[PDB]
Amino acid sequence: QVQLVQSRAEVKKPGASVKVSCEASGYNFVDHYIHWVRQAPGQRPQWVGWMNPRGGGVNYAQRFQGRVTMTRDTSIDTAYMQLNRLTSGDTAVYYCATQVKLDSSAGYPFDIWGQGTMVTVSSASTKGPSVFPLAPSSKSTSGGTAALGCLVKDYFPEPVTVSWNSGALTSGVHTFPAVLQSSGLYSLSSVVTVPSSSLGTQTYICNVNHKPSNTKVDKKVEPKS
Amino acid sequence: SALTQPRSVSGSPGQSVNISCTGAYSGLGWYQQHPGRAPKLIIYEVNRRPSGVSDRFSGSKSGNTASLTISGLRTEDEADYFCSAFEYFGEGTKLTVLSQPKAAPSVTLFPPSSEELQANKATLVCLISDFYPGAVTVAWKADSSPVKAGVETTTPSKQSNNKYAASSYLSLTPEQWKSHKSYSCQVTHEGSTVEKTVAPT
Ligand SMILES: *[C@@H]1O[C@H](CO)[C@@H](O[C@@H]2O[C@H](CO)[C@@H](O)[C@H](O)[C@H]2NC(C)=O)[C@H](O)[C@H]1NC(C)=O
Numbered sequence: 001q002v003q004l005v006q007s008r009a010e011v012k013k014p015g016a017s018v019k020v021s022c023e024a025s026g027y028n029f030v031d032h033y034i035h036w037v038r039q040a041p042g043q044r045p046q047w048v049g050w051m052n053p054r055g056g057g058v059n060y061a062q063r064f065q066g067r068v069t070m071t072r073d074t075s076i077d078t079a080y081m082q083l084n085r086l087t088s089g090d091t092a093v094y095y096c097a098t099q100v101k102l103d104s105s106a107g108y109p110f111d112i113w114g115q116g117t118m119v120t121v122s123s124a125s126t127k128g129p130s131v132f133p134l135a136p137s138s139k140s141t142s143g144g145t146a147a148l149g150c151l152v153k154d155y156f157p158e159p160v161t162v163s164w165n166s167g168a169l170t171s172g173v174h175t176f177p178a179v180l181q182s183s184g185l186y187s188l189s190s191v192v193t194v195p196s197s198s199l200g201t202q203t204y205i206c207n208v209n210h211k212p213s214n215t216k217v218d219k220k221v222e223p224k225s
Numbered sequence: 226s227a228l229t230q231p232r233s234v235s236g237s238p239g240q241s242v243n244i245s246c247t248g249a250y251s252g253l254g255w256y257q258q259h260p261g262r263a264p265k266l267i268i269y270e271v272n273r274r275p276s277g278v279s280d281r282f283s284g285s286k287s288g289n290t291a292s293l294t295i296s297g298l299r300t301e302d303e304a305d306y307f308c309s310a311f312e313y314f315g316e317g318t319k320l321t322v323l324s325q326p327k328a329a330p331s332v333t334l335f336p337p338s339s340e341e342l343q344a345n346k347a348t349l350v351c352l353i354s355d356f357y358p359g360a361v362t363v364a365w366k367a368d369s370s371p372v373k374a375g376v377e378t379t380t381p382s383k384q385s386n387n388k389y390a391a392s393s394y395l396s397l398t399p400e401q402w403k404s405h406k407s408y409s410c411q412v413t414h415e416g417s418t419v420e421k422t423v424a425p426t
Contacts, residue, residue, distance in 0.1 A: 042380070044315065044317055045264065045307065045309075045314045046314075047313070047314070061312070095263055095264075097263075102269060102275060103273070104269060104270065106253070106311070108253065108254065108309070108310075109253065109254030109256070109266055109269050110254075111266045111269075111275050113264060113265075114263065115262075115263055116262075116263055130344075132340055132348070133338050134335040134338065134350060135335075135338065139421075139423065140333065147333050149335070149352075151341075153348065174352075174354060174384075176352060176354075176379075176390060176391075176392045177382045178379075179377045179379045179392065179394055180377075181377050181394075181396075182377075187348075187377075187394060188392075189335075189350050189352060189392060191333060191352055224339065224426065225426075
């Protein structure tokens with residue numbers, strides 16, 4: 001089976017370098033150019049360059065010259081791509097690709113693709129979140145249901161688990177996917193919908209656990225003044 | 226080599242949709258891509274399928290504009306589609322296969338908490354849920370004037386009930402929060418707007 005298999009994802013500090021590997025199998029490695037294509041999240045693929053594994057020759061896109069390095073080890077059929085002095089603009093999934101099973105004259109386009117190597121370049125360091133209540137109000141309340149929640153703000157990295165009253169409250173809980181601020185840290189909200197008449201008789205705690213920073217926080221969400 | 230293709234196309238199950246791509250040497254490559262996966266070449270040399278690619282995908286080209294046609298639309302087809310010419314790629318076309326009734330978003334807006342304000346920060350939290358298709362635009366208003374700074378909006382994501390959810394965060398300083406009598410979160414979905422507003426206490 002003709003395939004390319006790449007190395008695991010990497011989280012790098014600005015200014016570091018990353019070396020992504022790409023092992024080919026099921027065909028003759030030295031016979032086909034290895035192409036590297038990167039794709040920033042939600043953007044268009046960006047061709048980085050190709051490497052001729054027969055003689056090691058390379059051609060890089062202009063905006064990477066002097067910064068990218070493409071090498072190969074023909075004895076184990078793996079190509080490498082090293083990108084230096086990383087910035088946040090280099091955050092992307094990095095693919096190796098090649099043309100093998102095609103009846104083509106060009107060597108473009110590519111029918112074999114690696115699974116991708118996510119490279120995230122961030123200055124964020126591991127940090128537990130600050131939890132803030134989101135209080136029920138008359139603007140939340142509708143038809144006897146009140147919406148309350150908590151704002152899990154500024155943590156890194158993913159994930160956090162949110163639960164309510166130690167998971168005793170599960171019905172009506174909606175935990176939203178987190179946003180990544182330009183700060184580099186994440187924030188998410190969890191909202192739970194409860195009977196408004198239950199308010200004041202019932203106590204609602206949101207439990208936040210951040211295993212990476214290893215914090216655990218409990219915080220209550222009761223009606224304001 | 227600047228290849229341009231429409232931003233989005235839509236269709237229902239079982240019908241046909243096509244995606245054009247204008248630019249020099251266009252149509253020499255057509256890629257389909259599902260989230261978290263490598264691009265899958267489906268068409269090459271304008272009209273040829275590689276082995277393993279379905280009959281339902283077809284290619285053609287008229288003048289400067291190659292067209293990718295997908296017949297018998299399945300929900301499997303919902304994906305991003307890229308044309309390519311040698312090293313260069315088009316910007317991409319998201320294809321939305323309409324698999325469920327149109328559902329308007331429900332919106333919830335929380336003001337900054339008192340504890341966040343005592344820490345000299347203010348976040349407004351606009352929660353958008355239960356909408357289909359997965360596409361909203363969020364605008365913020367300070368009283369009546371648009372606000373563009375301090376806004377972070379998530380891409381839509383699928384809930385357990387197959388509808389979509391998104392959220393938007395407006396970061397203010399306490400003084401800006403207190404110097405206006407209201408802030409609004411306006412969520413536009415399929416050309417129809419839903420607004421929610423909050424006020425300093
Ligand atoms: C792509 O699909 C569109 C339809 O969405 C085609 O436009 C239709 O073309 C046929 C043939 O001329 C007509 O019967 C329809 O009335 C057209 N509708 C519209 C709105 O134009 C278009 O021709 C297709 N293009 C290609 C290259 O297949």
